[PDB]
Design a protein around this ligand. Structure first.
Ligand SMILES: *[C@@H]1O[C@H](CO)[C@@H](O[C@@H]2O[C@H](CO)[C@@H](O)[C@H](O)[C@H]2NC(C)=O)[C@H](O)[C@H]1NC(C)=O
Ligand SMILES: *[C@@H]1O[C@H](CO)[C@@H](O[C@@H]2O[C@H](CO)[C@@H](O)[C@H](O)[C@H]2NC(C)=O)[C@H](O)[C@H]1NC(C)=O
Ligand SMILES: *[C@@H]1O[C@H](CO)[C@@H](O[C@@H]2O[C@H](CO)[C@@H](O)[C@H](O)[C@H]2NC(C)=O)[C@H](O)[C@H]1NC(C)=O
Ligand SMILES: *[C@@H]1O[C@H](CO)[C@@H](O[C@@H]2O[C@H](CO)[C@@H](O)[C@H](O)[C@H]2NC(C)=O)[C@H](O)[C@H]1NC(C)=O
Ligand SMILES: *[C@@H]1O[C@H](CO)[C@@H](O)[C@H](O)[C@H]1NC(C)=O
Ligand SMILES: *[C@@H]1O[C@H](CO)[C@@H](O)[C@H](O)[C@H]1NC(C)=O
Ligand SMILES: *[C@@H]1O[C@H](CO)[C@@H](O)[C@H](O)[C@H]1NC(C)=O
Ligand SMILES: *[C@@H]1O[C@H](CO)[C@@H](O)[C@H](O)[C@H]1NC(C)=O
Ligand SMILES: *[C@@H]1O[C@H](CO)[C@@H](O)[C@H](O)[C@H]1NC(C)=O
Ligand SMILES: *[C@@H]1O[C@H](CO)[C@@H](O)[C@H](O)[C@H]1NC(C)=O
Ligand SMILES: *[C@@H]1O[C@H](CO)[C@@H](O)[C@H](O)[C@H]1NC(C)=O
Ligand SMILES: *[C@@H]1O[C@H](CO)[C@@H](O)[C@H](O)[C@H]1NC(C)=O
Lengths: 454, 371
């Protein structure tokens, strides 16, 4: 129907190409009175979009709202939830602050976000930690909203695991930073992976505090979600080069593709609404001086152009595009991996060590280790076929297994290792405090010189 | 210097009352050069153009705390949501003094929802204190609601972990239906008589009339209800001898808003005693950045200590509400509101009247069967 698509100013996207994004398309237009109104707003106060809703809901009963925010504010999503609850108009938060992660949407609202839930994102992050076997970790949660469900999901997922995750006691910030009681909690931290749950500015403050206290070591990893990190256009100070993040803000899968997919979902919903029901316009007259069917529970497993854009029970997508990124050496959020329908895709599965996170920060505890299979010492077995998990009294290994007898290029098969010298090396790494770097030999036996060639 | 204050559409004398509180509070807080002001609203049933007038006026007015004080809505909205979301957009606390729902009182959904009243689930904590009154242990949970009901269940099991007993059966479902007589039969077939009941007015009244058509009103049927279950026709659809709860100085709107404005005024003077004074911006025109010291203002507010109060010794808990308020324990003695108990900060004091049960005599029924 009448759809007003107002956007922000992210990535300098012009307002002109969106008119031909639907215009020459929609060959089989079964709803006739369908129009688009492309709009931009130079201010992100609530008053602007409230005025837009009040003069465009009265503006010939516009039934469609697609909003994309360029700023870094999550209360805009709560305002859109309120507007979609009151006006009963389907609103699609696209990117930026338009689709940031809130706690619990209302049952009487038709708002949707084009992202994953915090449970799915925590599942992907724990899948990363399972694929890299980083079993010793911690958890730092502030008074940022939605923390009890998050810690509960982490504890149950550890309890739903075959790993036996080494979880340190959860560091809770009751009030603002004091450097009297928070410092004592930082001194208790000696694990590897740090899991932070706060805003972006508070994350910069905590990283600056950890850099001032020396808690930003190569051991001390940093995994935050997309809501902590935010948009790509702001990179503040005190960031380790290698800052692990998982976001759906794809610059490749750009804004025009997002809103075209939203148009396809809206046309699918309108086509099913016409094939099921007669009275297609369902709107409200005005805001001042104050429903038949819900489109919230109508387009659940919607699929447009072979894109799995099905809806969850929390307004999220079932399979959004999850992209794992890190910070490079050139202070940019470098794209690393993606996520399939079920399998975690790891392009850089070979994990880079990041010896230099900053200028004067050397790392000299990574020891390259190769071995050969001997029966009482080097016991190399398969990984789990169900969970891809070694039992935590074993260590991972990899091998450049060549496939064919003639070629020289092969794969890096990763397997489990138990034995005596395994335990010796683990007690050394607990004693000498280094990081073991185990892989397997591919040339053959121990050592034999053939004309100065070992 | 000047400090604006937002107002509520309820009536006309509370404005002069907090102007009197302005005149009294500026006297007892030193000779500082602060100035206090006010900003009124109009009569609109919906909160949409109310929040529109808020963002027209109160954002540019640089108010410090909006104290929403309209419980008697003629419709069934009960929505202080958009003004609270507008203030939390620039991180400003709102004293929501209308209802006691935990879905409003969630820190996950609502950012700065700091008021003086607690939600109804604290009554369940008082019900845990009721487990100290008659020394009863086998309990049965029955909550029709789901949003506040799950958090009430979580804090109920948290307090239940202390005695290390457990509830016999927990029950949550969808309100509005009436075919819950099978649930009444499932409640009959359990060996506890503690009927922990939590619902709305009409739903609890309807399921109690369904229980009354099922013989659940006889001897031994122990009923324990709250404020929403004694309001309206649920007050009419209540037996003769049921035990309910009541607030003290909650319906007393004048003293409530009086010591609320006193709390706000001492908090403003306490922040003026503190450094790093940042004002909320005039975000209506042009200003897109937010007031960054909102959680800093919450760090100021959550550490508030008191010694005097009109309604009583107010104190913020770990969730920003009243610690152990004055509570009343009512007994509908033959369709007559008869107060039989009070509850101070730590103890239940019965009055000189008796405690009449809906079943047998005034003594407590031994509802623990020998199986
Ligand atoms: C998505 O999951 C399935 C099962 O692993 C994979 O197969 C696709 O299934 C969908 C079902 O709608 C089909 O439309 C596609 O044609 C299938 N694609 C292929 C190539 O098999 C699929 O591999 C998964 N997607 C990705 C990104 O790997
Ligand atoms: C100081 O406070 C007074 C009282 O609120 C303000 O005067 C106006 O009073 C009327 C009610 O008679 C209300 O409309 C508002 O409270 C005030 N006017 C408006 C439209 O704001 C007075 O403006 C305040 N002074 C300043 C500059 O803060
Ligand atoms: C709760 O109610 C009791 C009612 O007794 C209040 O206690 C009285 O408070 C006054 C001061 O305002 C003092 O005379 C005594 O502390 C009490 N007097 C008597 C006779 O009880 C109490 O202030 C109220 N506040 C609380 C604790 O919730
Ligand atoms: C009202 O609250 C007060 C404050 O806790 C209670 O007084 C305490 O009662 C216990 C049990 O008898 C004593 O062990 C404490 O010494 C008392 N503390 C004092 C002196 O404040 C009191 O129980 C409550 N109401 C009444 C009068 O029963
Ligand atoms: C840009 O700013 C102007 C300021 O008047 C505003 O009118 C307009 O709606 C904004 N949006 C556009 C067209 O970029
Ligand atoms: C999900 O898709 C299937 C197959 O097209 C179909 O049952 C329906 O479209 C959806 N499920 C239901 C029952 O709505
Ligand atoms: C190995 O041989 C198989 C079968 O001929 C072939 O498909 C594969 O490409 C070869 N691998 C390489 C990299 O030589
Ligand atoms: C070729 O490689 C395979 C392992 O992939 C090995 O089993 C086989 O012995 C090799 N061919 C010969 C004839 O040695
Ligand atoms: C509940 O359901 C049963 C089966 O339909 C019915 O016999 C019973 O009367 C119902 N109870 C009421 C009165 O809602
Ligand atoms: C309760 O039981 C008595 C005795 O069997 C019977 O007379 C009465 O009708 C029952 N009341 C109801 C409606 O449950
Ligand atoms: C609160 O109680 C006082 C008496 O202490 C009374 O004057 C006032 O009207 C009450 N407020 C209301 C509106 O109930
Ligand atoms: C004000 O902020 C500074 C940091 O900019 C801090 O060092 C100082 O302690 C603060 N003072 C107070 C108590 O407000």
């Amino acid at each position: 129907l009448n759809i007003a698509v107002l956007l922000g100013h992210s990535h300098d996207v012009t307002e002109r190409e969106l008119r031909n994004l639907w215009g020459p398309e929609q060959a089989t237009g079964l709803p006739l009175d369908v129009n688009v109104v492309a709009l931009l707003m130079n201010r992100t106060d609530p008053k602007s979009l409230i005025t837009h809703v009040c003069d465009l809901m009265s503006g010939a009963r516009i039934h469609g709202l697609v909003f994309g925010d360029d700023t870094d504010q999550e209360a805009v999503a709560q305002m859109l939830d309120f507007i979609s609850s009151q006006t009963f108009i389907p609103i699609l938060g696209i990117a930026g602050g338009a689709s940031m992660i809130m706690a619990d949407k209302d049952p009487t609202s038709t708002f949707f976000q084009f992202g994953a839930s915090i449970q799915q994102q925590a599942t992907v992050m724990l899948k990363i930690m399972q694929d890299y076997d980083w079993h010793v970790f911690s958890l730092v949660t502030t008074i940022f909203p939605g923390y009890r469900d998050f810690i509960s999901f982490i504890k149950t997922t550890v309890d739903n695991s075959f790993v036996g995750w080494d979880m340190q006691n959860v560091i809770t910030l009751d009030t603002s930073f004091e450097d009297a009681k928070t410092q004592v909690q930082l001194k208790k931290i000696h694990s590897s992976v740090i899991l932070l749950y706060c805003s972006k500015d508070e994350a910069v403050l905590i990283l600056s505090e950890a850099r001032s206290l020396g808690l930003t070591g190569y051991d001390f990893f940093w995994i935050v979600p997309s809501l902590v990190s935010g948009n790509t256009e702001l990179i503040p100070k005190e960031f380790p080069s290698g800052l692990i993040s998982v976001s759906y803000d794809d610059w490749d899968y750009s804004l025009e593709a997002r809103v075209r997919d939203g148009l396809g979902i809206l046309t699918t919903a309108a086509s099913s609404m016409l094939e099921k029901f007669s009275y297609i316009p369902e709107a409200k007259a005005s805001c001042y001086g104050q429903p038949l069917h819900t489109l919230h529970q109508f387009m659940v497993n919607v699929t447009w152009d072979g894109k799995d854009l099905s809806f969850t029970e929390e307004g999220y997508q079932v399979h959004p595009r999850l992209v794992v990124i890190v910070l490079n050496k050139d202070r940019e959020w470098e794209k690393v991996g993606k996520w399939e329908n079920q399998t975690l895709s790891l392009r850089h599965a070979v994990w880079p060590r990041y010896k230099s996170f900053s200028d004067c920060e050397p790392d000299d505890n990574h020891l390259s280790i190769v071995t050969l299979e001997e029966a009482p010492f080097v016991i190399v077995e398969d990984i789990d076929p169900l969970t891809e998990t070694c039992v935590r009294n074993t260590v991972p290994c990899r091998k450049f297994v060549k496939i064919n007898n003639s070629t020289n290029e092969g794969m890096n098969v990763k397997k489990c290792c138990k034995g005596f010298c395994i335990d010796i090396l683990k007690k050394l790494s607990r004693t000498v405090k280094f990081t073991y770097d185990l892989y397997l030999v591919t040339n053959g036996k121990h050592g034999k010189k053939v004309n100065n060639v070992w | 210097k000047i400090v604006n204050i937002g107002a509520v559409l309820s009536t006309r004398k509370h404005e002069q009352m907090f102007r009197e509180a302005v005149n009294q509070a500026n006297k007892r807080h030193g000779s500082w050069k602060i100035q206090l002001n006010a900003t009124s609203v109009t009569h609109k049933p919906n909160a949409i153009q109310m929040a529109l007038s808020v963002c027209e006026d109160l954002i540019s007015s640089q108010v410090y705390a909006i104290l929403v004080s309209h419980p008697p809505t003629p419709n069934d909205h009960f929505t202080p949501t958009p003004v609270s979301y507008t203030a939390g957009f620039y991180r400003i606390p709102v004293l929501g003094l209308t209802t006691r729902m935990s879905i409003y009182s969630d820190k996950s959904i609502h950012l700065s929802f700091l008021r003086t009243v607690p939600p109804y689930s604290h009554q369940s904590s008082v019900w845990f204190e009721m487990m100290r009154v008659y020394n009863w242990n086998h309990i049965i949970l029955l909550v029709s609601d789901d949003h506040e009901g799950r958090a009430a269940q979580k804090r109920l099991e948290t307090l239940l972990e202390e005695r290390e007993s457990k509830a016999e059966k927990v029950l949550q479902f969808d309100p509005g239906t009436k075919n819950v007589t099978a649930l009444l039969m499932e409640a009959r077939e359990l060996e506890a008589r503690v009927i922990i009941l939590s619902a709305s007015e009409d739903d609890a009244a309807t399921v109690y009339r369904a229980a009354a058509m099922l013989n659940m009103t006889g001897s031994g049927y122990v009923w324990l209800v709250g404020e929403r279950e004694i309001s309206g026709n649920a007050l009419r659809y209540a037996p003769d001898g049921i035990i309910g709860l009541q607030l003290i100085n909650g319906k007393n709107e004048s003293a409530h808003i009086s010591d609320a404005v006193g709390v706000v005024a001492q908090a403003v003077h306490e922040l003026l005693e503190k450094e790093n004074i940042t004002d909320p911006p005039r975000g209506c025109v042009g200003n897109t950045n937010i007031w960054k010291t909102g959680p800093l203002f919450k760090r100021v507010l959550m550490s508030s200590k008191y010694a005097d109060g009109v309604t009583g010794r107010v104190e913020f808990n770990e969730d920003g509400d009243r610690k152990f308020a004055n509570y009343s324990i009512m007994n509908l003695q033959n369709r007559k509101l008869v107060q039989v108990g009070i509850y101070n900060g730590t103890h239940v004091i019965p009055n000189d009247r008796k405690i009449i049960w809906p079943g047998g005599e005034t003594e407590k029924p031994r509802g623990y069967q020998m199986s």
